[PDB]
Amino acid sequence: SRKFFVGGNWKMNGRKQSLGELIGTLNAAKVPADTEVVCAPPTAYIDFARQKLDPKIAVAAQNCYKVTNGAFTGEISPGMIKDCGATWVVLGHSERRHVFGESDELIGQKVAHALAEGLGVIACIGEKLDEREAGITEKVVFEQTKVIADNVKDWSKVVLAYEPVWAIGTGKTATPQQAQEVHEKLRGWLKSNVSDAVAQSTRIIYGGSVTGATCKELASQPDVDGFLVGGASLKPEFVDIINAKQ
Amino acid sequence: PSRKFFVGGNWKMNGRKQSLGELIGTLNAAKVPADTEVVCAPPTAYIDFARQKLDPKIAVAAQNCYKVTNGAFTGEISPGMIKDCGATWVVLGHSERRHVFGESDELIGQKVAHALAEGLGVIACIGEKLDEREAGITEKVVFEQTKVIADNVKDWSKVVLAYEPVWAIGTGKTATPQQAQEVHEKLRGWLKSNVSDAVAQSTRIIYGGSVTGATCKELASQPDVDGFLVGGASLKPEFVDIINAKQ
Ligand SMILES: [Br-]
Ligand SMILES: [Br-]
Ligand SMILES: [K+]
Ligand SMILES: [K+]
Ligand code: NA
């Protein structure tokens, strides 16, 4: 009975005028009560976004650091995120891992601290192309999930996001069947390494290519519980993804 | 054409709306001298907040930015966003970015060029590590860092150079007035030879690394020290005394 979860990752896009407009559109849309919607604005606009967005939509930070305060020029802490009214943080996003070199160890530390501070965490995992081509999809993704799991006590405020990095900007297409396949292996890992209740209740959302015209078939997959949306989250079509299970 | 005394407050990853609100209230009430250019750099989540609360006389800076205007860079912000929030400066190349988060010289240079193109001022940070100082190659290191910056600066009017020896940052071990003056002298001489005398004479070179209300006066008295980048003490009432260092 897992509640459909749709996250919108705006990445490094937008300004007050365009984002205010995007927010206006989301506020005007009807969001199904059985759908949990979260938007992740650029870090300069967390406060702005929370002020303008309907309380029904939650706000997420796109990243955070692993202690509450300190000499870390350019970083923000979970405490600041909560202070701005945001209730989630995205951690371990492929861009942080593969453009900014964030290690699993660091990601684990961030998860532990964010959860301790009272945030929910959208914890991202995923294998690159070379990893998949070498047949170590499972090794890579189970290892990433284990690091996350080793830093989670209460799974109620965690959502796992599978990013098929091998099929993001590579020329490869991930089929719904390939997505379902990994999601099923991930849920199996939870069942096997945590508990049946956790496996059954934890949302595992898809972070690959999703558009208004692809989301239905993906959402239909039994182990896909929603989406972490990239580019489409900036467009009115995001509303259609929110309404995938309608 | 005298160089205006410049005092930057880098709040780093500290503060919440309540405490930063109180910090800001104190600054607003202090009446900073028109003779001092004051800039505060809040955590990224509070740039908008700080600008809304701070008296217009005080400028706001971001603590970092990325090198393109928009894109698939989860967790980053661009100069355009910074300007949109009403901030007019960005701190680039801070020791913590370089040494905790591994930002390369090349990346910092790309950030400098983009920030300047987008209409921001840049506080460009350089500085040597302890091993480098105990060995005596301070000069080679900071010249190299400065050249990367300079290679990406065509107009110096909105650039401030911040010399922060890494061993002075957060350690309590403030460089002596002599140590700072000696480095600042050389950096100004570098600007003279490699850019122009006009840029050398007009560009603020500020010192940072354990600047406090007790050490600011004597550091400030050095002819080639044009102000400060203040970390820890920018979170304290002391910051007003530093702003008033020349008063
Ligand atoms: Br605090
Ligand atoms: Br500093
Ligand atoms: K499903
Ligand atoms: K001076
Ligand atoms: Na692709």
Side-chain angles (χ1 to χ4, degrees), chain A residues 9 11-16 42-45 47-48 62-63 65 67-77 79-80 83-84 93 95-96 99-100, chain B residues 10 12-17 43-46 48-49 63-64 66 68-78 80-81 84-85 94 96-97 100-101:
Chain A
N9 180 9
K11 302 188 181 189
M12 195 186 74
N13 292 278
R15 307 285 186 273
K16 281 183 177 188
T43 300
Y45 298 129
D47 203 4
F48 170 85
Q62 286 176 9
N63 192 25
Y65 202 52
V67 299
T68 192
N69 290 291
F72 302 104
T73 298
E75 302 294 306
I76 64 166
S77 67
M80 299 177 179
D83 185 46
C84 293
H93 190 273
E95 284 148 22
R96 300 311 310 177
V99 174
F100 299 100
Chain B
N10 180 9
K12 303 192 185 185
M13 192 182 80
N14 296 279
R16 309 286 185 273
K17 287 184 177 188
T44 302
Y46 300 123
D48 197 6
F49 172 80
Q63 291 177 5
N64 194 24
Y66 202 58
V68 296
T69 193
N70 292 291
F73 303 100
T74 296
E76 301 299 299
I77 64 167
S78 63
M81 298 175 178
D84 184 51
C85 287
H94 192 273
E96 285 142 27
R97 298 319 306 179
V100 181
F101 301 99

Side-chain angles (χ1 to χ4, degrees), chain B residues 56-241:
Chain B
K57 51 179 170 128
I58 298 168
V60 178
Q63 291 177 5
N64 194 24
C65 70
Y66 202 58
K67 55 162 177 172
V68 296
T69 193
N70 292 291
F73 303 100
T74 296
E76 301 299 299
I77 64 167
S78 63
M81 298 175 178
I82 293 163
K83 192 177 163 256
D84 184 51
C85 287
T88 53
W89 291 90
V90 59
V91 180
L92 292 175
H94 192 273
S95 178
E96 285 142 27
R97 298 319 306 179
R98 296 178 181 264
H99 303 125
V100 181
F101 301 99
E103 296 195 12
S104 64
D105 286 313
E106 307 90 273
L107 176 55
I108 288 158
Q110 290 171 323
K111 291 179 173 198
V112 167
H114 184 53
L116 291 171
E118 286 286 290
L120 292 181
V122 174
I123 301 162
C125 305
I126 60 179
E128 86 291 355
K129 283 91 100 191
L130 211 213
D131 59 334
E132 285 165 344
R133 178 61 84 125
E134 284 296 306
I137 73 164
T138 297
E139 179 173 15
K140 187 188 198 316
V141 176
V142 296
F143 282 1
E144 217 301 271
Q145 291 176 326
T146 299
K147 178 175 170 56
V148 174
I149 288 156
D151 287 340
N152 292 288
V153 175
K154 18 154 131 297
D155 183 353
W156 283 83
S157 80
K158 300 203 178 190
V159 177
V160 169
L161 202 49
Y163 171 56
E164 296 199 305
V166 184
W167 48 265
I169 300 172
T171 58
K173 187 102 306 97
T174 318
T176 63
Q178 164 175 21
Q179 281 174 321
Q181 169 56 32
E182 170 155 350
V183 174
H184 284 230
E185 234 158 43
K186 290 294 175 180
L187 291 169
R188 199 171 307 283
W190 187 99
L191 290 171
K192 175 176 182 183
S193 310
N194 291 271
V195 183
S196 72
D197 193 51
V199 166
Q201 298 324 303
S202 60
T203 306
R204 279 77 61 79
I205 307 174
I206 64 177
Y207 168 85
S210 297
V211 176
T212 64
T215 53
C216 61
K217 247 85 133 115
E218 196 168 355
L219 278 162
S221 68
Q222 302 306 125
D224 289 288
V225 175
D226 297 322
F228 304 110
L229 185 59
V230 190
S234 74
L235 300 171
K236 302 165 76 170
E238 223 166 300
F239 187 64
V240 179
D241 296 324

